Design a protein around this nucleic acid. Structure first.
Length: 255
RNA sequence: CGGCCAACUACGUGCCAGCAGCCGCGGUAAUACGUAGGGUCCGAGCGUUGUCCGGAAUUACUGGGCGUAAAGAGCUCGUA
RNA sequence: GGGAGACUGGAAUUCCUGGUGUAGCGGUGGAAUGCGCAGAUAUCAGGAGGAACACCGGUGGCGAAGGCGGGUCUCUGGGCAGUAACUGACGCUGAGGAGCGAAAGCGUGGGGAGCGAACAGGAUUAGAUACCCUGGUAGUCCACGCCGUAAACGGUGGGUACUAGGUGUGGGUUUCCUUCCUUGGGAUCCGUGCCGUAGCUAACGCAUUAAGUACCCCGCCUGGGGAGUACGGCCGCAAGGCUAAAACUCAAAGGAAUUGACGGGGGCCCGCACAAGCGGCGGAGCAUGUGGAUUAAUUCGAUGCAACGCGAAGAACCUUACCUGGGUUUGACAUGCACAGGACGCCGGCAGAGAUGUCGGUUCCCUUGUGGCCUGUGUGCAGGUGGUGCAUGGCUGUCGUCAGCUCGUGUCGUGAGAUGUUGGGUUAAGUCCCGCAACGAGCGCAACCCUUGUCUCAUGUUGCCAGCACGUUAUGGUGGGGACUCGUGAGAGACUGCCGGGGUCAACUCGGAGGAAGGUGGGGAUGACGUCAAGUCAUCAUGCCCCUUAUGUCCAGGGCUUCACACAUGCUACAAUGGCCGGUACAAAGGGCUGCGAUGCCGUGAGGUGGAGCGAAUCCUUUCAAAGCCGGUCUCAGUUCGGAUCGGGGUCUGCAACUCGACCCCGUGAAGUCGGAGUCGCUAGUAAUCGCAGAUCAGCAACGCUGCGGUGAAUACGUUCCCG
RNA sequence: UCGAAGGUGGGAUCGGCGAUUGGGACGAAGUCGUAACAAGGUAGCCGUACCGGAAGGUGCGGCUGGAUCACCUCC
């Protein structure tokens, strides 16, 4: 490390002492230092109790660390400047050991500015305690085609819709298939040829709607995280679509 | 003879010499250092030191307190 | 869930055994030690063992305190309510004393799954005897005993009586709604919380569970350290515990609360702050400034933002304040008290580097009292870029053109202080609206000013020329003309003015019409209280100190330009989006009298001669530019790039270009191949790039500064990170 | 016989010195580190135990005289 000292007036021996005292702080800086300068001045007025003024500037990897002290002589000023610079460099570290106690920790305990925001679902929580099923629509079970079902979707502003298919005579549910288009799920999977003709670009889910109970359906919805579950009820034997409502209850659509 | 505490100016000196009961005054322009004027309190006396009481409700009988300022035993039983 | 003893239940962790089964498992902010490939992890079945008891489960119960919940049984302590049968003050407290007393720790004997001091490696770090990771011994567990400490806290000793209430919750008795289901409600006794009177307190707060009002008993305190330490003593296997000083030293140590400041605290916002981009710096040569070194001197000031092309808008001499040497002293320059005068003053010669000295010619007008000049003699005195911007004024920077900073009265608090200035919304804004123990006001914001973008009226010279005539190429050049520009006077025009929608029908906000311009249109001038003892005793002034035959003053020469290096600001480049040559088109602004200076002529070119016309909308700076466009050539090379350095020859200014000017001509032809860590500027006529002009100025170090125009981009998803 | 003084002996108790050695108080500027105070960058403190150049670290139990927890949609 190389230091330049720009003294002023009569300060014999201050330059060497300041050089050798400040150059020892290179190991303290955790990043390479560049062009570290020091300046010594003396107050002309004898009325000042601490006439000597010392200033130091270091460029630690682009970060400017500067300090300034007053003293009665060159030696005291240089020593105080060294202590001040050491404290500043300690507060500057920014390496992991010095930035590990401020990084957000745990999952829910403690909150910080950069702590990860809580993931909130669209629905009101309404935990399993008194969740209940307080919405049961049975809008339409008149047979429809894919295009007619899509239009019945669109003006209802509902992502999924349960109807009964024209060609099959079976219950089916359409939903937005994402970027792939739309997706159709039937109680028993059938190919497109048996399905009534359509013009919208859709795809058919190959899996069949399984048979399961109400509590099992709620458990599957909870452990599978889908926006809804379409299934054949075990007791009823017919189609059913459960979705988490906008109040936290489950919306069971039945024929 | 800065304030407690009656009684201010000039010169000499400058973190020196020094003063001081406490707070604190000496860093070329000090009512706090030294000397001169001026002033005030006492007066055959005036100050300093040493000892005791008061102010000290600062051992609180008259006349104190214990959550956080010092102060409730770690908690019960029980002798005088 | 009060305590002790005995028996016993399940989930899960670990290990072992046996199947299926592969190449990873484990761990972190990221990894590595580690485990596994000899079959791990995963999955199933079986077995062994130890510890703790998910849900119930809480500010809910019990206990004097420590503390106490898997289930069942046995033994046992306490409490509450009702009846009030019974005894009849037998009550309260308690020095010493005895007993109980979390965890850790000690002794003997067992047990040991998980966790885990100590101890190993792994990782982070400048260093890690730590935080994080992989293992892991005591210990945690049981039996019998020791110790006797805790933030053993409600930091609140025990008993009693009284002093507004309101509302949760645990236990028990009873009256009335009455279904008599129901926390129905009431009454009452005993607990356990929250809010709140009076009252108390320094305040925070306590407030029928007192820290209120009083009585009885006990313990404890007398400033902070030294110190709960030493000595002595008691207890203990030991660790150590209990009792417990002094010397010396300090003028304080402390409790509560207020205003700031700060935070690797939170929330809401801003800014080229970041993000997306464009161009750079840091690498090279040169210009400039600074540090350091050097020197006789390298005059002085300025040191992050806010010093470092700054004071310096012009250092050869002068400037100049520094050095060497030579002179000078009421002085280089002022004004007053005096003595003598008619000269001071000039002009030539000589000596000297010059200052200066000397020589030669010239000599006052008033008016008799003297005045103007200087001489010397003097005497007050001048004169200091000598010191102190921590004694100052004045001037300036900066936070920051950010939105904030205060005051009057009122109110609250013992007081510092608080409210207003907070809260919701909105804005560029403490801008505004609605609320509100506040009601108002002031400096700040905005507006009033300049410029710019549109139009109308007025307006025609040196400015335009559209329609008319003369023109000679040379063109508004000339007569003429207000028509279009332009010049400069007045005025209009943006005011959420209008419409639609959000909005508390409020501020305000989104969109639309109109208009040249739509929402402070674009840019300026303007910088609140103050901060940083910021800068300036070198623009100036100035208190105090200092010099005064000198730190004043005159002159010559030199220095401020020195250079083994370091930092900063810029310019030119590294080339084909280019170099060179030829042709050719478009600006704005500004300057000019002892200055701009044209035509012509002479030089290759700086330039020389010469002087037309101009104090200038006229003449000159050329009629003005360069980038630009067209044509030719060069062909990816240290080159036809780059220009440094050096040799020779000249011009101009200046008394004088050696130290130390600029420019011109010929030759010479270095580094340099787009530049590490890092870092800067910029949101539109902007960045980038091109040229012109001005101040200072005899000449210039100007590539610097201040303005003017030409051509003119990319990007902004959005506030997580950096700075303020 | 008692009897002062004196002699002998083993102890008590109060002080002084003591080679070496422990800690304490203060000292602008020395050396090594950042422990605490803003969540002080690993919350702090109390009792106890072990370890470490040093502040200190860790294990068990306890206390708050520890900071923050944006947004939060149903109603």
């Amino acid at each position: 490390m190389d230091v330049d000292v720009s003294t002023d007036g009569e300060l014999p021996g201050a330059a060497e002492y300041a050089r050798e005292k400040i150059g020892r702080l290179s190991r303290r800086a955790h990043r390479p230092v560049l062009h570290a300068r020091v300046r010594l001045t003396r107050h002309g007025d004898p009325a000042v109790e601490r006439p000597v003024i010392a200033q130091a500037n270091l460029d630690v990897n682009g970060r400017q660390v500067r300090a300034q002290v007053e003293g009665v002589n060159a030696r005291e000023a240089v020593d105080r400047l060294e202590a001040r610079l050491r404290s500043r460099l300690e507060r500057i570290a920014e390496h992991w050991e010095a930035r590990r106690g401020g990084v957000p920790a745990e999952a829910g305990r403690e909150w910080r500015h950069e702590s990860e925001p809580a993931r909130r679902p669209g629905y009101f929580p309404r935990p399993p305690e008194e969740r209940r099923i307080i919405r049961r629509k049975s809008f339409s079970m008149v047979p429809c085609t894919v295009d007619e079902a899509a239009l019945e979707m669109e003006m209802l502003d509902y992502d999924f819709h349960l109807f009964t298919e024209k060609g099959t005579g079976f219950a089916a549910v359409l939903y937005k298939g994402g970027p792939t288009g739309y997706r159709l799920v039937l109680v028993i999977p059938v190919p497109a040829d048996e399905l009534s003709p359509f013009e919208k670009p859709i795809t058919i889910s190959t899996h069949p709607a399984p048979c399961l109970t109400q509590r099992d359906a709620v458990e599957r919805l909870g452990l599978l995280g889908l926006p809804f579950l379409f299934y054949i009820d075990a007791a009823e034997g017919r189609a059913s679509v459960i979705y988490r409502r906008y109040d936290g209850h489950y919306g069971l659509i039945t024929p």
